[PDB]
């Protein structure tokens, strides 16, 4: 029965008809467009002064369907290419296009990809979101919303990962700004850069500024007390007095992802300061096994679910290290060119990373 191929022929005809309607819209337009100008002067209800962006201005008429209230003075419009009359008015935009927002809200599904310390994530969300959601109540009752929160655990669970994930309930744009990148020169005029980044947040009003490293290596080397004396602290006081950056109006918070809260200028933990600090350390056994499970999630092999034995060898390993553990298991399997990953591969990966960090420390 040739009639049963009617379905395949119908699919072919629909597929080619999409292309045919596309080409019909492409050739039916065949337009020359309209030239772009600005309303230099309205002159009168009938004649108007429209200046092209590149020289000549003309006394033209207006589009019949449009009205002067839609045209207005000093607004971008479109003139007819040949007859030189207003055809449509268009909105304009400017862009600084430099050092702008880099990380945005989409991809905020990491609320399940964090795994460890879900209670800690919940607590940080409880602290942050409500002023971020409806700050108007804070002005309405006369109370100042918090500025942000402090995060510990220098190499441990992903502080930046938490910054990304917690914005799920926030629908905000997390920004990864470095303290050194913000201070630049060692002058009090470093506040210019903070002004620029706060203006960027203001433009993208639902934003959270995630700081990279303020207490530069809080575990060792030079702290706030050593090396640059008080430069970091004064630059932070700049963002502290920024707190009057229309907290009621502006949906901007700042998370401080320090390594160690040891040298953090206790003058910056008073009320009105950063205030809230949430404790993050190296993941416990439960968080460790959970993050191991989520790391192995994308990996589908034979293996086993013997996560506790892996935890036993890999105790006190940071979340990034455990992600590296899963990647090393994959690397071992592929170096063997084996399409299977068994618990022995996990044992090899854990031993490899443990020996590596033991030698490096």
């Amino acid at each position: 029965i040739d009639g049963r191929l009617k379905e395949l022929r119908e699919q072919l005809k629909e597929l080619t008809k999409q292309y045919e309607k596309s080409e019909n819209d492409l050739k039916a337009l065949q337009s020359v467009g309209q030239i772009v100008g600005e309303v230099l002067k309205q002159l009168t209800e009938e004649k108007f002064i429209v200046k092209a962006t590149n020289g000549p201005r003309y006394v033209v008429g207006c589009r019949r369907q449009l009205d002067k209230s839609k045209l207005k003075p000093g607004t971008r419009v479109a003139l007819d290419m040949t007859t030189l009359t207003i055809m449509r008015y268009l909105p304009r935009e400017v862009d600084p296009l430099v050092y702008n927002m880099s990380h945005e809200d989409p991809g905020n599904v990491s609320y399940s990809e964090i795994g460890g310390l879900s209670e800690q994530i919940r607590e940080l969300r409880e602290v942050i979101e409500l002023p971020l959601t409806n700050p108007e109540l804070f002005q309405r009752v006369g109370i100042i919303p918090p500025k942000g929160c402090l995060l510990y655990g220098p190499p441990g669970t992903g502080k930046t990962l938490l910054a990304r994930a917690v914005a799920s309930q926030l629908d905000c744009n997390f920004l990864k700004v470095v303290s050194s990148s913000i201070v630049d020169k060692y002058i009090g005029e470093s506040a210019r850069l903070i002004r620029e980044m706060f203006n960027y947040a203001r433009d993208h009003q639902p934003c959270i500024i995630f700081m990279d490293e303020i207490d530069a290596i809080g575990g060792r080397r030079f702290s706030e007390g050593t090396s640059a004396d008080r430069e970091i602290q004064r630059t932070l006081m700049e963002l502290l007095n920024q707190m009057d950056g229309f907290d009621t109006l502006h949906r901007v918070k700042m998370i401080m992802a320090t390594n160690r809260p040891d040298t953090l200028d206790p003058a910056l933990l008073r009320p009105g300061r950063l205030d809230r600090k949430i404790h993050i350390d190296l993941p416990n056994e439960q968080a460790r096994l959970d993050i191991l499970k989520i790391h192995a999630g994308p990996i589908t092999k034979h293996g086993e679910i013997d996560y506790e034995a892996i935890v036993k060898l890999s105790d006190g390993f940071n979340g990034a290290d455990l992600r590296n553990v899963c990647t090393e298991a994959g690397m071992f399997a592929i170096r063997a060119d084996h399409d299977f990953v068994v618990q022995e591969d996990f044992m090899k990966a854990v031993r490899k990373v443990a020996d590596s960090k033991k030698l490096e420390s």
């Binding site: 040739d2 072919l12 337009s31 772009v36 090396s227 994959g330």
Partner: protein
Amino acid sequence: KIMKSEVLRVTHELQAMKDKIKENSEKIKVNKTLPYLVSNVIELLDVDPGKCAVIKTSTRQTYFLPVIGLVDAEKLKPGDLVGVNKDSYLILETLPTEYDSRVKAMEVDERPTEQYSDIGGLDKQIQELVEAIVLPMNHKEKFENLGIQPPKGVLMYGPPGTGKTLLARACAAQTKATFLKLAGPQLVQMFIGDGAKLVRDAFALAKEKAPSIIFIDELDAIGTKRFDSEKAGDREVQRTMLELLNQLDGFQPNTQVKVIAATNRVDILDPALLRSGRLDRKIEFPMPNEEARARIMQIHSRKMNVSPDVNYEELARCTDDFNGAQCKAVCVEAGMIALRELTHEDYMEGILEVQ
């Protein structure tokens, strides 16, 4: 059934409408064979009461072609160098953009031919970085089906003459993919954001040309250890370092275009470039031992047939604290003196000459 009449209409409609597509495409393509105006897309997403475009012509004018009447805004993003109708004032077709003067071809080698066999000594490290880079190029589907995204950032740290450049070019050749070399020490430009623009367009070129090898040299020069002082504090170059950092994450999906950074001392860098997704594979490049130095110079002089039966053992004894470059210089110093020494004694003076 109805199929006979249906297919009788179907073949005719398909062929005739594809002929009409050919006619329209030719009438537009000779205009696409004569595009003249640059396409500075001031993109306004005018949805019809879908999209639209503002084009800044080369002759300093603005053309507002409605709804971008030939091409799709998915492939046409706000940018430049996309064909514009000279007569119809319409977006005609995409075309390659401009790679920022210097980055058009700064030092890009189309294809390196140096082979892995002519280098050695650090064979364990070279095999490690081969597994970390070249295997993600040839057997990329292997990593894809495994589910582990290969790392990209590999940092070869070690004194000069340890063969980082040759190893990188050989790895690129083995991948048979594009190779882009960055001259790090000269990335410090007085122009504001100049290094940032160079890095941006270098990554753009690598992305546009295959899974490439971005071989950035002098990573120590690029990044300071934040040892700020009154003399200087790495104020401006921090912009470029941050630009590189932000560019490192562009190619995470489809894991392609690997980053290889060569320096001597890894410790001169802040703990910011070092990350799992960032530069992670920090590989040591030590000065070769006597055996490795002898083998390397032997391989270099393999294309020389003048003095038979030179075991280079006295050479190895006399190659104390020398690089692969120094061994090559030693062997070619013989390649310069061995006219008309010769065997086992025309090698010492090469190092003595340099100082």
